[PDB]
Structures are given as C-alpha cells and as structure tokens.
Amino acid sequence: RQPPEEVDVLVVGAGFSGLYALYRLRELGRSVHVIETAGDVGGVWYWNRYPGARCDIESIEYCYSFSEEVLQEWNWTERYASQPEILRYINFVADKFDLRSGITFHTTVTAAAFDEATNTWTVDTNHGDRIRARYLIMASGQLSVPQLPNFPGLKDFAGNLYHTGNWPHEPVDFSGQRVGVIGTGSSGIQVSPQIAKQAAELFVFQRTPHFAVPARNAPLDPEFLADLKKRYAEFREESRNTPGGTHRYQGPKSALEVSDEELVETLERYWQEGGPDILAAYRDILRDRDANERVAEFIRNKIRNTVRDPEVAERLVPKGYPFGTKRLILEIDYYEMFNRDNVHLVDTLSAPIETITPRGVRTSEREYELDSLVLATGFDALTGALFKIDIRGVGNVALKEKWAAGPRTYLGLSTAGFPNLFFIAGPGSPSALSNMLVSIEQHVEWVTDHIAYMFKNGLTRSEAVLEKEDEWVEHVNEIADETLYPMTASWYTGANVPGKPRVFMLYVGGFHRYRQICDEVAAKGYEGFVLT
Numbered sequence: 270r271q272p273p274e275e276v277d278v279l280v281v282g283a284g285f286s287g288l289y290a291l292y293r294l295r296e297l298g299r300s301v302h303v304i305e306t307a308g309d310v311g312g313v314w315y316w317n318r319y320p321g322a323r324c325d326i327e328s329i330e331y332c333y334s335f336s337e338e339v340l341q342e343w344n345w346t347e348r349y350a351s352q353p354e355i356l357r358y359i360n361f362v363a364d365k366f367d368l369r370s371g372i373t374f375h376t377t378v379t380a381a382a383f384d385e386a387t388n389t390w391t392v393d394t395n396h397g398d399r400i401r402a403r404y405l406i407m408a409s410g411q412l413s414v415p416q417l418p419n420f421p422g423l424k425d426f427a428g429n430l431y432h433t434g435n436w437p438h439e440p441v442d443f444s445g446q447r448v449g450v451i452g453t454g455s456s457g458i459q460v461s462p463q464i465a466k467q468a469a470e471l472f473v474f475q476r477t478p479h480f481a482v483p484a485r486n487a488p489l490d491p492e493f494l495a496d497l498k499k500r501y502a503e504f505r506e507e508s509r510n511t512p513g514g515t516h517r518y519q520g521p522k523s524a525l526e527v528s529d530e531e532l533v534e535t536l537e538r539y540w541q542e543g544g545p546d547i548l549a550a551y552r553d554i555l556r557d558r559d560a561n562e563r564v565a566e567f568i569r570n571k572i573r574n575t576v577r578d579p580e581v582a583e584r585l586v587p588k589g590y591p592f593g594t595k596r597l598i599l600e601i602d603y604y605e606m607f608n609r610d611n612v613h614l615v616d617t618l619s620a621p622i623e624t625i626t627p628r629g630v631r632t633s634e635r636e637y638e639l640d641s642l643v644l645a646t647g648f649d650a651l652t653g654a655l656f657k658i659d660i661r662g663v664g665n666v667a668l669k670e671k672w673a674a675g676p677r678t679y680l681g682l683s684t685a686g687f688p689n690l691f692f693i694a695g696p697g698s699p700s701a702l703s704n705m706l707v708s709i710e711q712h713v714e715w716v717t718d719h720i721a722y723m724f725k726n727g728l729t730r731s732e733a734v735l736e737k738e739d740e741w742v743e744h745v746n747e748i749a750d751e752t753l754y755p756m757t758a759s760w761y762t763g764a765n766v767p768g769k770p771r772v773f774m775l776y777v778g779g780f781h782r783y784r785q786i787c788d789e790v791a792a793k794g795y796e797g798f799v800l801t
C-alpha cells in the first residue's frame with residue numbers, strides 16, 4: 270500500500286506475529302495497518318533463504334491454529350518443513366485473508382514517540398511517513414537483526430560475503446569455490462552440508478562447539494495427516510497445555526536416580542527417534558549439573574563415534590557449558606560431512622581469528638584463502654530490532670536507555686512509562702523457549718483482546734505499574750537462577766554481542782504457567798496495569 274495518516278493500531282512486522290495481529294484486529298472491528306521492511310510477508314522465513322534452512326519443530330506443531338479452514342486445507346509434506354515450504358504456507362494464509370491490503374512493504378520504522386496530551390503514538394518511517402496510532406504493537410521479531418562480528422578484516426575481503434539472515438533471493442553458486450563458514454550454531458550446521466557439495470574446499474570456522482542431535486527427518490504420511498485433521502483443534506489444545514508448546518514427553522525421573530544401563534537405554538531410544546525431545550528426557554537436565562552432565566556425556570560419545578579421525582572428532586565435542594543451555598540443534602549429515610576429504614574444521618578456540626584479509630581469514634596459525642565467506646554468526650537477539658528504532662515514552666525516556674542494563678517488562682508484554690505499547694513474544698515472556706507459534710498466538714490474542722476491552726469501556730491509556738514491572742523482572746531472574754541457563758554465554762543472555770549486558774532475558778517457567786498468569790491478570794481487569 271501507502272500507509273494511513275491515522276489508525277487505532279499500528280503493527281511493525283509482517284512475519285507470523287504481525288500477520289495474526291492484523292487478522293485478529295480487523296475481526297475485532299478495529300482499524301489496523303502494518304509497516305514492514307521486507308518486500309513481502311514471512312519475517313524470518315522471507316529473510317533466511319540460505320540452502321538447507323529448515324525448522325527444528327515438527328510441521329504439524331509449527332503452524333497457525335486460529336483458523337479451522339487453514340488447518341483442514343494445508344498439506345504439510347515432511348517431519349520438519351523447509352524454509353521454502355514454510356514461506357509457501359505464510360503466502361497461502363496471507364492470500365486467504367487478503368492481508369496485504371493492510372501492509373506497507375519496503376518501509377522501515379525509524380522512531381516512535383508517545384504523546385501524553387493525546388494518549389497516542391506518533392510513528393515515523395525511512396520514507397518520510399508519519400502515522401498517528403492509539404496503540405503500538407511491536408511484532409518486529411526476536412532474531413531479526415543479523416549480527417556480524419566486528420572482525421578487523423571485513424570490509425577488505427575481496428571475495429563474496431554473505432550472512433545467512435540476509436541471503437540473496439536467487440540461489441548462490443559455490444561450485445569449485447574455496448568457501449569459509451564462520452559460525453556453527455543451527456544456521457552454520459544447516460548451511461555447511463549444502464555448501465560442502467558444491468565447494469572445492471570448505472573450511473568451517475568453529476568457536477564453541479554446540480550440541481546437535483539427529484533430526485531423523487522423514488516424509489509425512491498423508492494418511493496420518495488426514496487422521497490428525499479429524500482432531501486438530503484437540504491436538505493443538507494438548508500442545509498449549511505444556512511447558513514447551515509441543516508434544517515432547519515430560520520425563521518424570523531424575524537423570525541421577527537411574528542406573529548407567531537404564532540411562533544408556535533411554536537416551537539411545539531418543540537418539541534413534543531423532544529430534545529435540547531428549548531435552549526433557551529427565552526432569553532435572555536443566556537444573557542440576559550432575560544430572561546434566563550424564564546426558565551431555567552420552568551425546569559427546571555419539572559425536573566421537575560419528576567422525577572417523579579422532580582428532581577432528583574431539584574438536585567437535587562440546588565443552589565448557591551445560592547441555593541444553595545454548596539452543597539444542599538438529600543436524601542432518603553435519604557430523605558425517607567432516608568425513609569428506611574436501612571439508613576442514615578450523616578450531617578457532619585454540620587458533621583465534623586475528624583478522625579477515627583481502628584473500629581470506631588469518632588465525633594465529635595460518636591464513637586460509639577463500640573466494641566466498643558465509644557468516645552464520647547469528648542475531649542481536651530479542652532487543653536488537655527494538656533498539657534500532659528511536660522509541661520515546663513518557664518524559665521522553667528512550668526505551669534504549671531504560672533497558673540498557675537489560676530488558677525491563679511487566680509479563681514481557683509492556684514496560685512501565687511506555688503506555689499503549691506491546692511487544693510480541695519478546696524478553697520477559699516464554700518467547701523462543703517454546704514452540705513460537707504457541708507463544709505468538711497467545712500474545713497476539715491477549716493484546717488484541719486487551720485493546721478490544723479498552724475501546725469497549727471507552728478507556729484510552731494502558732500502562733504497566735512500575736512496581737509490578739520491578740516485581741516481574743525480579744521473578745524472571747529468580748526462576749532463571751534455579752536453572753543452568755544463566756551459566757552460559759548464549760544469545761538468550763546477550764553474551765554474543767560485545768558490550769551487550771549479560772542477563773538471561775526469557776521467562777523459563779514454561780508456556781502453560783505463563784499462560785495461566787496472563788489469564789488471571791486479564792480476568793481481574795488487567796491487574797498490574799493502570800487504565801484511564
């Protein structure tokens with residue numbers, strides 16, 4: 270489009286979160302419009318088009334549930350949907366509900382300011398648009414600002430330079446190239462086996478080794494799909510009533526109580542079945558360091574037995590941090606890749622990168638000559654997208670400033686001093702610790718219900734109570750401190766961005782309990798919010 274001067278609700282972001290908000294707000298009888306930087310819908314599945322890109326949550330879980338028609342119609346094809354497929358899904362939903370007529374594309378919001386006189390937001394874009402809106406919904410993502418390390422050589426590299434979160438829209442040809450991949454999180458583990466098949470030589474620059482387990486992907490049986498469809502709302506209600514927003518089995522035992530022989534036998538069953546459910550095999554894997562370590566060691570042994578050169582294998586073995594505290598990764602022929610002659614593991618812990626050079630990468634041991642260099646170096650997560658926008662609350666406080674020692678929220682949904690502003694599936698909430706379609710739908714519903722409630726009662730200003738926000742922040746840190754999550758440098762704590770404050774940013778109590786807390790809050794008239 271071309272955006273309206275005035276609107277009840279402005280939404281930023283046209284991925285999963287913004288599309289649903291735009292959908293539900295129209296149903297609720299509210300004027301609403303979306304501004305999005307990308308050329309089209311999809312959010313992470315529009316930007317992340319690198320080869321091998323693929324979801325780690327089963328296709329049947331990772332999908333919308335607000336529309337029965339969508340659930341009956343869509344045909345998923347495999348256990349874990351590839352990126353192109355998930356993008357076809359999102360295009361399908363966008364077409365079905367005519368969503369694009371409410372979205373300005375190619376447009377980046379740059380500043381937003383709350384106006385105490387009118388109880389409204391004024392939102393500016395990089396095209397010179399100015400929009401006035403009663404409420405502001407930031408659906409701008411969790412993993413939406415690419416993080417490029419500030420390596421000394423970078424702007425001098427004479428080859429082709431890429432980042433997996435901003436991938437060309439036409440396939441890139443690596444045939445006969447020497448190619449370097451920096452980063453071995455889920456992006457790098459998924460991209461490298463694809464590049465390994467085209468490149469003359471592939472150098473995988475690893476820092477901390479991450480734990481990954483086999484995906485065991487497979488065709489989805491069309492019979493099973495037809496069968497699921499008969500009870501689809503029931504199946505999703507079951508997933509909503511869990512810590513993780515999926516059908517993972519919640520292992521009741523402690524990893525410490527079991528004999529060696531029972532532990533091997535349980536873990537081996539998880540490993541053969543494939544997928545991430547091993548994380549919840551015993552109740553204390555994320556709570557107790559001796560529990561965690563008996564599982565970790567099982568995993569490190571599978572890695573040693575997968576790679577034939579034991580020197581290379583040992584370099585791949587994760588050390589230094591508890592299993593499950595960086596995101597657990599699903600791999601498809603990633604370890605086996607290192608048995609190819611043309612694939613090299615460069616351990617940068619023992620040989621740190623000193624600089625990028627015109628021809629390649631220099632570590633303390635040698636220089637590597639490369640035609641292309643792929644950064645799988647992640648995202649300035651959870652706060653990176655909000656921080657790129659000049660957002661100003663009451664008394665002209667900048668959000669960037671209030672949150673400079675870490676995000677401060679009530680329920681993650683709002684921050685005090687910034688009335689009428691909501692963050693979708695961000696810091697202070699379950700967010701990426703659960704299936705994100707479950708986190709996102711529940712936030713979009715709770716916020717849009719809240720906005721409908723304000724118009725219904727002729728209220729115009731919603732603001733979190735400062736003391737409740739402070740209590741909520743404290744609570745989030747205290748329950749996080751009963752787990753091993755804060756022990757490790759991950760994007761969850763911000764420790765991947767130099768200078769970023771190190772605080773575990775997510776609610777760890779599980780989706781289900783959080784959902785309960787949010788319903789209790791709404792049921793009592795939005796206790797902990799002041800409305801006028």
Ligand SMILES: Cc1cc2nc3c(=O)[nH]c(=O)nc-3n(C[C@H](O)[C@H](O)[C@H](O)COP(=O)(O)OP(=O)(O)OC[C@H]3O[C@@H](n4cnc5c(N)ncnc54)[C@H](O)[C@@H]3O)c2cc1C
Pocket residue numbers: 281282283284285286287304305306307311312313314317322323324325326376377378379408409410411412413654657658693694701703704705706709
């Ligand atoms: C490659 C990858 C794979 C994933 N795999 C899974 C999975 O297996 N499990 C899981 O549960 N989740 C996974 N995620 C997490 C993912 O973030 C969520 O599942 C979900 O897609 C987030 O949707 P969103 O709408 O909340 O944000 P996004 O998908 O990131 O959408 C936000 C949009 O806002 C736009 N935007 C940002 N700032 C501005 C601005 N200033 N002005 C205008 N527009 C702006 C962005 O361009 C983006 O399009 C994955 C993440 C990535 C990066």
Ligand SMILES: NC(=O)c1ccc[n+]([C@@H]2O[C@H](COP(=O)([O-])OP(=O)(O)OC[C@H]3O[C@@H](n4cnc5c(N)ncnc54)[C@H](OP(=O)(O)O)[C@@H]3O)[C@@H](O)[C@H]2O)c1
Pocket residue numbers: 323324325326412418419451452453454455456457459475476477478596599617645646647648701760765
């Ligand atoms: N399959 C999927 O469903 C999928 C795919 C991609 C992304 N995602 C989501 O998005 C998240 C991020 O994935 P990601 O792989 O893009 O990023 P990541 O998990 O943040 O990993 C970034 C990688 O780059 C390395 N790195 C960062 N800075 C570096 C530096 N200065 N020098 C050398 N190495 C550096 C990190 O090393 P260290 O660990 O040593 O810091 C790590 O190996 C995932 O955890 C998941 O939530 C999901």
